[PDB]
């Protein structure tokens, strides 16, 4: 029995970024724009979507 890895996501604020693969087995990666970041501390960073 295995366990999935859920590492801390990368957030680039009001800019751009690109996906990169990893040597880890059964690895998966994907970007997403127009994020809606919120947390108990609030909007992690600021720019109009």
């Amino acid at each position: 029995k295995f366990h999935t890895v859920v590492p801390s996501p990368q957030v680039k604020c009001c800019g751009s970024l690109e996906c990169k693969a990893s040597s880890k087995a059964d690895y998966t990666c994907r970007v997403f724009g127009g994020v809606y970041p919120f947390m108990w501390g609030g909007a992690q960073c600021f720019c109009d979507s």
């Binding site: 999935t4 059964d26 998966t28 990666c29 809606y36």
Partner: protein
């Protein structure tokens, strides 16, 4: 082969190098807070068990 015996394979128990594929697909952020929704098939070990 996802959903089958021996989905996760390794040369040794404590081998750093591993190979596996279990059909992991990322989901787009869909809520207020920062979250990473992950969808994956059930582990094959418990299935064969």
């Amino acid at each position: 082969n996802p959903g089958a015996f021996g989905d996760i394979q390794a040369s040794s128990l404590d081998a750093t190098d591993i190979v596996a594929r279990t059909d992991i697909r990322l989901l787009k952020p869909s809520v207020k807070n920062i979250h990473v929704p992950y969808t994956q098939a059930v582990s094959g070990y418990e299935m064969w068990k």
